[PDB]
A paper describes a structure:
Following the demonstration that PA2788 specifically binds nitrate, this chemoreceptor was named [name]. No nitrate chemotaxis was observed for the [name] mutant, suggesting that it is the sole nitrate chemotaxis receptor.
[name]-[name] in complex with nitrate was crystallized in a buffer at pH 7.5, and its structure was resolved by X-ray crystallography to a resolution of 1.3 Å. According to the Matthews coefficient, the unit cell accommodates three chains. Chains A and B of the unit cell form a dimer, whereas chain C forms another dimer with a symmetry-related chain. The [name]-[name] monomer is composed of 4 α-helices that pack into a 4-helix bundle. Dimerization is achieved through the interaction of 22 residues of chains A and B that establish 16 hydrogen bonds and occlude a surface of approximately 1,100 Å2 in each monomer. A single molecule of nitrate is bound to a site with a positive surface charge at the dimer interface. Whereas G58, A59, and M62 establish nonbonded contacts, R61 played a key role in recognition since it forms two hydrogen bonds with nitrate. Taken together, the data indicate that [name]-[name] was present in a monomer-dimer equilibrium and that nitrate binding stabilized the dimeric state.
Residue numbers in the entry:
A (entry chain A): 14 to 139
B (entry chain B): 14 to 138
Write the structure that this text describes.
Amino acid sequence: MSISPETINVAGAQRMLSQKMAREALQLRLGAGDPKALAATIAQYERSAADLDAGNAERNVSRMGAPEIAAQRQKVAQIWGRYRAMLDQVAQPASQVDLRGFSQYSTELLGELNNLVSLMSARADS
Amino acid sequence: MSISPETINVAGAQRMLSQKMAREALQLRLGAGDPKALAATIAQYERSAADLDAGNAERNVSRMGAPEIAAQRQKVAQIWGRYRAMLDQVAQPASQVDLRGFSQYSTELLGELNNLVSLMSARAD
Ligand code: NA
Ligand code: NA
Ligand code: NA
């Protein structure tokens, strides 16, 4: 591997975080949740996204400048912005939302994050 | 690396699957879910757990026999068995369930899956 294992770990964990935040938001919709937990999960995702975009030497996350990888990070980022806004709405018990649309979007983001991991691994691995 | 990168990918994805299942079960609790999706996610976790325990040549998942890794897979399996049962309760809109208990247990399983990934990576480089 040309990148650190931690780089691939952080990218893979984005997949998990996307799902964790959805569960936390749905639990908030049910009135049994914790806004602090949701915020913290979203913050972990965003911290990792910035680390993957810029590199983070302290955290041992490599910036991968390959154009296809950078393009996939940007594709992910556009989906993420819309998903993040949906999370905020889902988490409010009294809001109007489309829960099937939310689920579809969670699955879409997950797929694009998995695609990011795949591209990173292809470039990194022998 | 002594193990295939796919081995680490599959172990990491178990973290994700544990959380996807919770998302799906809560969607079902809210009447906006899909039982087939939850079933598929559970099945994927179970196949991957089997692959990590035994190896799977077709899928390029390597065996890792180090005692600490085997012990952690066993620890995960005990938590998983209990978690899996909780899912069915959560997913029923009309059940009485303790959702905070469920989320705590989801986070516990996630942590042990993360610990498994860490142990695997340490051994693999
Ligand atoms: Na919550
Ligand atoms: Na083994
Ligand atoms: Na097992």
